[PDB]
Amino acid sequence: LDPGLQPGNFSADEAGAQLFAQSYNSSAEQVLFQSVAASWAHDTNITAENARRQEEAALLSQEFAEAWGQKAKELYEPIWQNFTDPQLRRIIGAVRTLGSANLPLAKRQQYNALLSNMSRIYSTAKVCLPNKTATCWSLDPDLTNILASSRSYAMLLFAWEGWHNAAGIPLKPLYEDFTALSNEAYKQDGFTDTGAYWRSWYNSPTFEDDLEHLYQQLEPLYLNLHAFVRRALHRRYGDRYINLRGPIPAHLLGDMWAQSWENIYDMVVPFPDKPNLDVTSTMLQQGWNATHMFRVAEEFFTSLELSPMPPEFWEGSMLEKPADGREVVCHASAWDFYNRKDFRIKQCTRVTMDQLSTVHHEMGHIQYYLQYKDLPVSLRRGANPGFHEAIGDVLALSVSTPEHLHKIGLLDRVTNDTESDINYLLKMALEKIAFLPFGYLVDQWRWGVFSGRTPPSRYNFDWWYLRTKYQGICPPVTRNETHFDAGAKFHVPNVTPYIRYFVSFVLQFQFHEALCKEAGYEGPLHQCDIYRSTKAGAKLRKVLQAGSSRPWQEVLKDMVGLDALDAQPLLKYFQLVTQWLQEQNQQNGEVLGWPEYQWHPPLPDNYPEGID
Ligand SMILES: *[C@@H]1O[C@H](CO)[C@@H](O[C@@H]2O[C@H](CO)[C@@H](O[C@@H]3O[C@H](CO)[C@@H](O)[C@H](O)[C@@H]3O)[C@H](O)[C@H]2NC(C)=O)[C@H](O)[C@H]1NC(C)=O
Ligand SMILES: CC[C@H](C)[C@H](NC(C)=O)C(=O)N[C@@H](Cc1ccc(O)cc1)C(=O)N[C@@H](Cc1ccc(O)cc1)P(=O)(O)O
Ligand SMILES: *[C@@H]1O[C@H](CO)[C@@H](O[C@@H]2O[C@H](CO)[C@@H](O)[C@H](O)[C@H]2NC(C)=O)[C@H](O)[C@H]1NC(C)=O
Ligand SMILES: *[C@@H]1O[C@H](CO[C@@H]2O[C@@H](C)[C@@H](O)[C@@H](O)[C@@H]2O)[C@@H](O)[C@H](O)[C@H]1NC(C)=O
Ligand SMILES: O=C(O)CSCC(=O)O
Ligand SMILES: [Cl-]
Ligand SMILES: [Zn+2]
Numbered sequence: 200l201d202p203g204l205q206p207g208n209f210s211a212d213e214a215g216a217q218l219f220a221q222s223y224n225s226s227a228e229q230v231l232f233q234s235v236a237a238s239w240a241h242d243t244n245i246t247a248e249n250a251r252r253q254e255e256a257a258l259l260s261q262e263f264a265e266a267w268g269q270k271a272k273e274l275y276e277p278i279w280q281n282f283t284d285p286q287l288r289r290i291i292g293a294v295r296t297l298g299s300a301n302l303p304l305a306k307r308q309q310y311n312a313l314l315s316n317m318s319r320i321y322s323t324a325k326v327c328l329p330n331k332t333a334t335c336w337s338l339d340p341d342l343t344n345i346l347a348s349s350r351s352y353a354m355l356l357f358a359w360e361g362w363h364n365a366a367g368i369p370l371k372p373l374y375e376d377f378t379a380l381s382n383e384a385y386k387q388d389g390f391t392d393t394g395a396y397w398r399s400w401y402n403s404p405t406f407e408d409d410l411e412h413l414y415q416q417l418e419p420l421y422l423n424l425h426a427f428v429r430r431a432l433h434r435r436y437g438d439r440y441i442n443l444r445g446p447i448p449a450h451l452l453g454d455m456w457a458q459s460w461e462n463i464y465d466m467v468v469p470f471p472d473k474p475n476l477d478v479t480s481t482m483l484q485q486g487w488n489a490t491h492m493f494r495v496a497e498e499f500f501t502s503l504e505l506s507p508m509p510p511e512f513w514e515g516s517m518l519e520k521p522a523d524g525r526e527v528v529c530h531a532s533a534w535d536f537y538n539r540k541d542f543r544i545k546q547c548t549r550v551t552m553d554q555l556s557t558v559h560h561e562m563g564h565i566q567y568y569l570q571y572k573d574l575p576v577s578l579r580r581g582a583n584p585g586f587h588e589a590i591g592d593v594l595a596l597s598v599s600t601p602e603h604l605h606k607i608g609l610l611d612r613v614t615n616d617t618e619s620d621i622n623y624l625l626k627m628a629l630e631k632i633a634f635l636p637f638g639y640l641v642d643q644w645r646w647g648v649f650s651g652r653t654p655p656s657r658y659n660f661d662w663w664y665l666r667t668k669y670q671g672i673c674p675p676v677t678r679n680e681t682h683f684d685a686g687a688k689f690h691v692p693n694v695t696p697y698i699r700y701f702v703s704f705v706l707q708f709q710f711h712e713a714l715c716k717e718a719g720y721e722g723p724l725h726q727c728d729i730y731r732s733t734k735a736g737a738k739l740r741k742v743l744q745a746g747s748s749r750p751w752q753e754v755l756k757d758m759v760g761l762d763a764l765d766a767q768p769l770l771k772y773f774q775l776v777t778q779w780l781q782e783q784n785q786q787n788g789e790v791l792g793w794p795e796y797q798w799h800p801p802l803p804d805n806y807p808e809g810i811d
Contacts, residue, residue, distance in 0.1 A: 200262040204230065206270045213282045216275055220290050223267050224576040230263045231537040231576065239536075241315075242528040243517050243545060245322060250315045257311040261300040268297040286748055290577040296396075299380070301387040306380060313377045317692035320369050322528045326361035329807055338362065338455070339520070339529040339547050346455050347462040352436055353803045353810045356675050359450035363687045370686035375655045377694070378648055394649035397642070397696050401583050402750060409764060410639065410698075413705055416766040417635050420773065423780040424632050425671050426789040428452075428460065431467040444790050445798035446673040449666070456688055457672055458637045460629040461553055469625055469779070470618040476601060476626050478609040479552045485608070489518040489548035492555050495607065496562045499594055503729065503736025505743075506569045508562070511541045520547035530689045531557055533564030535579070539572040553630070556595040563591020571746035582742070582751035585702030590743065592707040593714065597728040599627065606730070624725060624776035631704060632773065636669035638701035644685060645697070658683055671793045675800060708769040713759045714738060724772050 204226045209215040237256035241249040271279075271294045279295075282288045299310050325335035326342060336342050336358070345358045381393040390396045398406055425447070432451055433441040440448065453462025464477055493508075501507050521527060529547035536542070544561050548554060567587055571579050581587035597603055601623060604610040613619065644665050647653035653661040659678055662685045666672055678684060685691045712724060718732040729735045738758065745754055752762050759765075770777070784791065803810060 200230075200259045200266075204263060205266050209270075209274055211274045211278065213278075213284065213287065216279070216282065216287060216291055217284075219271070219274065220287060220294075220575070220577075223290075223294060226267075227263070227576045228537045230260055234260050235534060235536045239534060239543070239545075242318075242322075242532075243521075243525075245319060245526040245528070250319065253315055254308070254311045257314075258304075258307060261298075261302075261307050264297050264300040268295050268300065271295045285750075286578070289747070290575070293577055296388045297384075298388070299384045301384045302380065306383070309376070310380045310384070313373050313380070314694065317370055317373050317377070317686075317694075318528070320373075321366055321686070321689065321692045322530075323526055324362070324365040326358065326365055328811065330811060336361075337529075338366075340549055342455065343549075346450070347453055350435070350466075352440055352451075353806055355450045356803065357807060357810075359455065360676055362455060363682065363684050366687040366692075367683040367685075368681060370692050371655070371658065371681075371683040374683070374686060374692065381694075382649060392649040392651070394642075394646040397698075398646070401585075401702075403752075410701065413764060413766050414635070414639055416770070417632075417705075420628075420632050420770070420777055421635055422791045423777065423784055424628050426784050426791055427780050428463070428467055428629075430787055430789065431463075435466060440800045442795055442798045442800075444793065445795035446667055446671045446793045448675045448800050449670075449672040450675045452633075452672075456637065457670060458634055459553070460633040461626065464626050464629055467625070467629075469621045473614075473619055473622060474601075474610055474612055476604075476610070476623055477552055478604055479550075481609050482550050482552070482555075487550050489546075489550070492548060492550070492558045493518060493544075493562070495555070496559045496594075499559070499598065499730065500562065500566055502731045503594075503739065504733045505566055505736055505740060508565065509540075509542065509569070512543060512565065515541060515543045517543075517545045518548050530693075531561050533561045533568070535568040537576060537579070542568050556592075556599065556630075559595040559598060560588075560591035563587075563589075563594065566590060567743055570740065570743035574746045574748065578746045578748050580747040582745065582747060582749070582754045583702065584696065584699035585706055586742070586751065586754075588699050588703035589707040589710060590739075592703060593710045593739075594729070596627075596707065596711050597730055600726060600728050602726065603728045603730060620723075620725075621776060621779050624773060625780075627725070628773060628776055628780075631769075634704060635701065636671075638697065638704055640665040640669045641685075641688065641690065641697035645691070656680060658685065667793070667796060673799050676802065677799070702764065705764050705766060705769060708772050709755075709759050709761070709765055712768040712771070723775075724768075725775075 206222065209219045234256045237253045241253045271291060275291055276295070279288055279291045299307060302310060325337055327335035342358050342362055345354060349355050385393045385396045388396065390399070403409065429441065429443060429447050432447060433443055436451065449457050452460045454460065497508050517527070520529060527547070528545070531546040532544070534543040534545065542565050544565065546558070546561060548558065564587060567581060567590055568579070601610055601613040601619070605613055644653070644662055647661060648658070659680050659682050663674060663678065674684070690697050711727070714729050714732070714735040715724060715727040717738050718727070718729050718735045720727045742754055742758055756762055
């Protein structure tokens with residue numbers, strides 16, 4: 200790539216490996232910077248030239264990783280793993296893994312070009328109306344808003360079917376080629392497949408057993424929530440479109456992927472007439488904008504004596520969807536340019552309660568970057584990716600409490616009684632409990648694809664098996680193997696792992712319990728607010744500053760006092776609504792689960808032409 204960035208002479212000792220690590224990280228910052236810079240230029244401004252520059256930067260990275268990774272094994276292949284320094288062998292281990300740099304140039308370009316094509320197709324896909332193909336809808340905000348607020352079966356379906364056909368179908372041939380190239384690359388590193396590489400980041404010999412054990416404890420909660428919500432949908436949409444012993448049609452839960460259910464809170468509220476805990480209409484009434492939401496988030500972090508967002512963030516970030524007519528990736532993201540200075544968020548922010556927590560979630564990533572920027576490049580990661588995803592969510596739990604919402608002016612009164620307490624915990628259940636099966640299943644699908652279990656001829660078949668098995672949902676229309684419904688979820692074509700979200704959703708409640716203890720708080724865990732707790736903030740600062748220097752299991756014991764992940768804090772948090780939901784399901788004579796697994800709803804009568 201460039202002589203200055205290539206490695207020189209180092210001895211085959213542990214002492215030389217320390218010198219090797221320092222020279223690697225120094226040159227790496229420059230390589231990562233141009234790569235992240237070119238990705239930013241593309242994702243905020245999607246064109247052919249920016250894609251070309253993106254791919255050109257991707258090649259240089261692979262050239263860098265090859266030279267240093269090849270030189271690492273040359274010097275340290277047999278002797279590494281036997282070093283006394285835990286931090287060193289972690290760094291050296293990551294360096295010898297070349298990834299897509301194991302491929303020849305011809306295949307490197309194919310690998311890099313596929314990523315850009317899959318990314319381009321996903322973010323530029325549109326849904327046009329069939330009769331008057333003029334006003335085509337994008338995913339964000341148009342289809343997102345339709346799925347959130349529309350209560351028309353036909354309209355919801357048209358949006359769901361349109362998006363899955365638009366994104367999915369053209370992605371399939373490209374995703375097949377990527378999977379083969381990805382496996383070829385990571386097999387030369389000694390992994391069975393790419394999936395095995397992804398799972399290794401959690402450095403646990405019994406990882407799949409642990410996750411499976413956690414979900415078994417969490418399944419009863421989802422089953423009761425599922426049943427209760429199914430009953431409410433039955434009353435709304437009727438006996439034809441809802442089967443009380445079958446799976447719920449996947450377009451009715453208020454979300455394109457049915458990943459979180461908060462948008463149907465109004466339909467399923469236990470005790471209505473009380474102050475609406477969805478503060479979205481108040482935000483719009485008071486005139487909240489994107490800039491307000493990020494600053495409200497920032498203030499929460501600084502109240503814990505964590506770092507404020509630097510000048511570069513406010514200068515560089517994209518906090519609203521451009522009105523220039525530009526084509527942008529609207530999926531929210533948090534950016535580290537590896538120059539210990541430039542940090543940014545790219546978000547097509549809408550003024551809504553769930554977006555306010557998304558803002559917190561994205562700012563949690565940034566806060567992480569800010570806390571470990573002084574560490575060496577290889578250690579600028581979370582203890583595991585799940586830690587990175589859980590920081591912003593932990594604070595959001597405090598923020599969402601009716602007491603805190605009152606303090607920031609979004610809720611006029613909170614009568615502390617049993618009925619308000621059930622209203623809130625159900626709302627949080629629709630956000631947190633509903634997601635668990637989806638967070639768990641996405642990577643199970645991908646682990647099967649990478650391992651060869653799920654060939655192209657079974658992509659959709661295996662996707663909907665897992666969707667039905669875990670979420671208890673069915674496709675609102677018939678699907679075959681021309682469709683590729685997994686590709687209609689951002690993370691699949693953008694090749695970024697999803698298991699971190701299941702880990703994060705379990706872990707954020709372990710964190711929340713630990714911080715409320717250190718805040719000196721007592722009483723029900725779901726009414727805790729760590730706002731302005733410098734003591735709780737000093738606990739968070741230490742884990743964030745650790746980065747990836749210490750193994751996540753020991754980092755977790757210093758914080759929570761336990762070696763591993765644990766479902767108890769999550770169960771403790773929700774206990775009251777769990778008992779309440781079981782009570783209600785028994786009184787309604789509900790069947791938990793979906794015994795009629797084959798059932799699918801019929802089409803609307805004049806769909807699509809006529810209904811529009
Ligand atoms: C809303 O109502 C709930 C239910 O009554 C309140 O929970 C109760 O809060 C009080 C005061 O914080 C807790 O008192 C504490 O009890 C422990 C004993 O475990 C004691 O060591 C402390 O010194 C303190 O006296 C009480 O435990 C707690 N009840 C339960 C069942 O957890 C809640 O505080 C109310 N929320 C608001 C904002 O007023
Ligand atoms: C093109 C660069 C990426 C956008 C970025 N990488 C860098 C070096 O800034 C990155 O992976 N950021 C992670 C948050 C994250 C970052 C690092 C971690 O170790 C873990 C999480 C992130 O923003 N994830 C988001 C989803 C996402 C993930 C990857 C993308 O390319 C785009 C969006 P979120 O989970 O907040 O919905
Ligand atoms: C979007 O990217 C394109 C390039 O892919 C940018 O277009 C160039 O802009 C520079 C700077 O003004 C001009 O000198 C070039 O003539 C343009 N080239 C082409 C091919 O159009 C464009 O500026 C970017 N848009 C934004 C808002 O940054
Ligand atoms: C896959 O399905 C395609 C379209 O689906 C069919 O027609 C639409 C309008 C709906 O009525 C739906 O229920 C039907 O299944 C077919 O055109 C295509 O041939 C199918 N692909 C394969 C390989 O069979
Ligand atoms: O809602 C979020 O952003 C957190 S869950 C991850 C996802 O979006 O798929
Ligand atoms: Cl992950
Ligand atoms: Zn995230």
